[PDB]
Amino acid sequence: SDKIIHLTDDSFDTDVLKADGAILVDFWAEWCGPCKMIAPILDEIADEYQGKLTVAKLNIDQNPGTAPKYGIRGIPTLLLFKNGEVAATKVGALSKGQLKEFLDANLAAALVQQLPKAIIIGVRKGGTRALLEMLNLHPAVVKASQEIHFFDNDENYGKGIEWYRKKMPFSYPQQITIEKSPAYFITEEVPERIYKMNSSIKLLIIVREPTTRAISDYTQVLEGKERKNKTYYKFEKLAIDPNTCEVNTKYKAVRTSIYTKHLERWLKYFPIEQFHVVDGDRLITEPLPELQLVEKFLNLPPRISQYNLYFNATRGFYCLRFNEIFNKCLAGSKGRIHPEVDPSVITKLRKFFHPFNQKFYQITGRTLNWP
Numbered sequence: 347s348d349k350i351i352h353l354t355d356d357s358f359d360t361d362v363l364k365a366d367g368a369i370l371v372d373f374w375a376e377w378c379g380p381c382k383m384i385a386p387i388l389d390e391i392a393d394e395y396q397g398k399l400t401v402a403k404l405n406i407d408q409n410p411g412t413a414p415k416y417g418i419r420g421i422p423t424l425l426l427f428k429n430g431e432v433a434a435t436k437v438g439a440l441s442k443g444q445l446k447e448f449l450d451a452n453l454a455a456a457l458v459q460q461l462p463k464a465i466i467i468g469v470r471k472g473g474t475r476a477l478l479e480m481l482n483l484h485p486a487v488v489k490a491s492q493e494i495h496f497f498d499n500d501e502n503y504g505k506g507i508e509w510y511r512k513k514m515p516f517s518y519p520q521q522i523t524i525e526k527s528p529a530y531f532i533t534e535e536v537p538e539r540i541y542k543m544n545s546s547i548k549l550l551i552i553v554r555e556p557t558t559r560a561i562s563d564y565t566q567v568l569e570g571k572e573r574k575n576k577t578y579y580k581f582e583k584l585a586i587d588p589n590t591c592e593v594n595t596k597y598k599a600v601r602t603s604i605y606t607k608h609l610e611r612w613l614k615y616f617p618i619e620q621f622h623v624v625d626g627d628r629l630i631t632e633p634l635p636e637l638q639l640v641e642k643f644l645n646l647p648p649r650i651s652q653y654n655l656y657f658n659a660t661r662g663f664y665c666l667r668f669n670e671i672f673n674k675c676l677a678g679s680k681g682r683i684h685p686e687v688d689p690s691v692i693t694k695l696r697k698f699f700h701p702f703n704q705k706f707y708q709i710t711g712r713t714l715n716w717p
């Protein structure tokens with residue numbers, strides 16, 4: 347649960363000089379009395395300043411090379427670095443008020459609404475909400491908690507990019523905003539609009555087994571009709587053409603699962619390097635490895651840990667653990683009791699997707715091992 351980076355001489359360059367934004371470094375030693383008194387104050391500050399400041403320590407007895415390069419002749423010393431250059435210093439023991447006065451006087455943390463620098467564009471039912479919720483565990487990530495539907499709605503898109511920006515949450519300059527809008531993946535007119543706004547934007551795609559995703563899709567549409575006391579057909583009657591007895595390519599649930607078909611459209615405007623495909627099947631069984639890849643994709647330091655995720659045998663999925671008294675599980679619409687589909691139909695669907703799946707692996711570079 348520790349939020350303080352433990353530094354060494356060998357790690358100082360990568361963790362401090364090559365870090366983005368603001369880092370406060372405490373130079374300390376076991377023999378330094380005031381260092382010990384101030385140590386818990388830094389723990390409080392690391393929580394209160396999450397998103398604007400990272401806190402780090404270097405033990406100068408164990409790592410004696412770094413302090414002489416900064417002329418440090420007494421400890422505790424607090425050095426505030428920004429982008430590899432010393433920004434401010436404080437010498438000696440100080441109280442919380444002096445430190446907060448020092449930090450507030452030295453950090454340019456204009457809380458601002460910024461346009462997203464990463465967008466979860468799909469795919470619906472692949473775990474888009476879950477992915478967004480998990481990425482928000484990173485101190486530098488700030489989520490747009492509602493779908494805004496900007497690029498897929500001519501009405502909203504007419505209001506201009508500024509309207510979109512002012513629909514984003516407040517964040518600090520050094521924070522990265524992430525939006526989730528599954529419909530963007532399928533809406534045919536959306537890649538050009540996003541490309542125009544920011545051609546270097548990063549795009550996130552979350553997928554799970556094609557056939558499974560279609561059944562999850564069907565279940566939601568079914569629940570929506572049963573809620574309103576309406577009628578609906580069985581999955582089989584919709585996914586299989588009655589006449590030919592083949593897969594019904596006109597059914598949206600099936601078309602949406604042909605991930606490759608949609609990706610081709612997006613690739614006409616963005617290079618594959620700007621995309622990262624998250625394995626939704628692995629996100630359910632073992633999230634952390636998939637989330638750690640997203641961290642590197644976003645140029646974010648490793649900060650999501652195994653402590654943040656815990657298995658809830660009751661709900662049957664993983665839930666989020668932020669601090670010691672803030673837990674959050676996903677809503678009831680996440681984790682629906684799927685209907686049993688005739689094994690024969692499932693086999694036909696699996697074979698149908700197979701060639702599209704192999705193309706997807708080849709284009710994206712990630713083999714997801716789907717049946």
Ligand SMILES: O=C(O)[C@H]1O[C@@H](O)[C@H](O)[C@@H](O)[C@@H]1O[C@H]1O[C@H](COS(=O)(=O)O)[C@@H](O[C@@H]2O[C@H](C(=O)O)[C@@H](O[C@H]3O[C@H](COS(=O)(=O)O)[C@@H](O[C@@H]4O[C@H](C(=O)O)[C@@H](O[C@H]5O[C@H](COS(=O)(=O)O)[C@@H](O)[C@H](O)[C@H]5NS(=O)(=O)O)[C@H](O)[C@H]4O)[C@H](O)[C@H]3NS(=O)(=O)O)[C@H](O)[C@H]2O)[C@H](O)[C@H]1NS(=O)(=O)O
Pocket residue numbers: 470471475479492493527528529530566567570571574576598675676677678679680
């Ligand atoms: O098909 C027909 O018959 C249509 O025919 C036409 O000719 C007629 O004219 C129409 O009248 C007929 O309408 C029906 O069919 C259309 C088309 O469907 S389509 O073919 O699939 O396209 C239906 O319209 C579509 O309905 C979709 C749907 O999924 O129902 C829409 O999908 C998008 O939007 C939904 C709804 O979002 S929202 O309103 O909530 O904003 C998304 O599903 C919800 O996702 C949110 C989410 O943000 O994750 C969930 O919110 C939960 O979680 C929140 C956060 O919690 S936590 O952090 O996880 O812990 C929490 O704050 C919420 O409280 C919580 N909700 S909860 O209920 O309390 O649990 C919701 O749970 C999800 O339901 C969906 O992901 C999104 N997908 S997208 O499209 O890919 O973007 C779609 O936009 C829309 O066009 C029409 O409804 C239908 N009418 S009928 O059923 O009456 O027949």
Ligand SMILES: Nc1ncnc2c1ncn2[C@@H]1O[C@H](COP(=O)(O)O)[C@@H](OP(=O)(O)O)[C@H]1O
Pocket residue numbers: 469470471472473474475476528562563629630663664665676679680681682
């Ligand atoms: N920790 C988690 N808790 C609940 N559902 C999760 C989850 N991680 C992934 N999911 C999955 O994400 C799906 C919904 O994705 P989306 O938010 O894009 O609609 C769920 O569909 P099911 O209801 O079919 O299980 C479920 O499989």
